[PDB]
Structure formats: structure tokens, C-alpha cells
Swiss-Prot record:
Regulatory subunit of the ATP-dependent BRF-1 and BRF-5 ISWI chromatin remodeling complexes, which form ordered nucleosome arrays on chromatin and facilitate access to DNA during DNA-templated processes such as DNA replication, transcription, and repair. Both complexes regulate the spacing of nucleosomes along the chromatin and have the ability to slide mononucleosomes to the center of a DNA template. The BRF-1 ISWI chromatin remodeling complex has a lower ATP hydrolysis rate than the BRF-5 ISWI chromatin remodeling complex. Signal peptide: none annotated. This is Bromodomain adjacent to zinc finger domain protein 2B. Residues 9-113 form the Bromo domain. The chain holds residues 2054 to 2166 of 2168 of the full protein. It comes from Homo sapiens. The gene is BAZ2B. It is found in: Nucleus. Belongs to the WAL family.
Amino acid sequence: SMSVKKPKRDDSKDLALCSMILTEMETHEDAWPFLLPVNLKLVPGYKKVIKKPMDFSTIREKLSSGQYPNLETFALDVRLVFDNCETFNEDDSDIGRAGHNMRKYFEKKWTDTFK
């Protein structure tokens, strides 16, 4: 509350560490469905169904331009990429499987770097 603060967590490395995680996501062999925005002219249904499209390149630009106020807003966009994928793709599809694999990979790196 006013003039009453928990001890200050060092957040000065968070930008660099989110960039490293994002690099590791970008270079995973199963990243290919997620590297670029889904083409809303060429993929019927996507525009109407997925209210908030997200992809790695869009996260990378937001990161590089100071559009994430903190590390939690960064994790929310990464998770949004996988939530969108599960909304639109069957579990038993190459893209459906890619999304589950990448979410697992991300959540481990996140825990090991920050928890």
C-alpha cells in the first residue's frame, strides 16, 4: 500500500532473457506454423473466428519496440499464439501437434528462467 512495498525483484535482465527465449522458439523445428501472421485473405474462417491473431514475428517486433510493459504481458502473447492454434486446428494434425509441442517447450523455458 502507500509507502509499504515488498522487496524489489531485479527485472533489469527481463528484456534480454525474453529475447533469448523468443530466439529459441523461432529456431525450433516445429515453429513453422507460428513464424508469420496467418494470411487472413487466404485462410477462410480465420479472420472471423480468431479475435486476436498473434505470431512470433509480431511478438518480436513488439519486444524490440518497447511495447511489452513487463514479462507477464510477453508470456500472455506467447500463450495467445498457442490458444489460437488450439482454437482453429484439430489436435491430430501436424499444426495441432506443433502447437502442443511449442507450448510445452515455452512453459519449461519460462519456469527455468524466471521461477
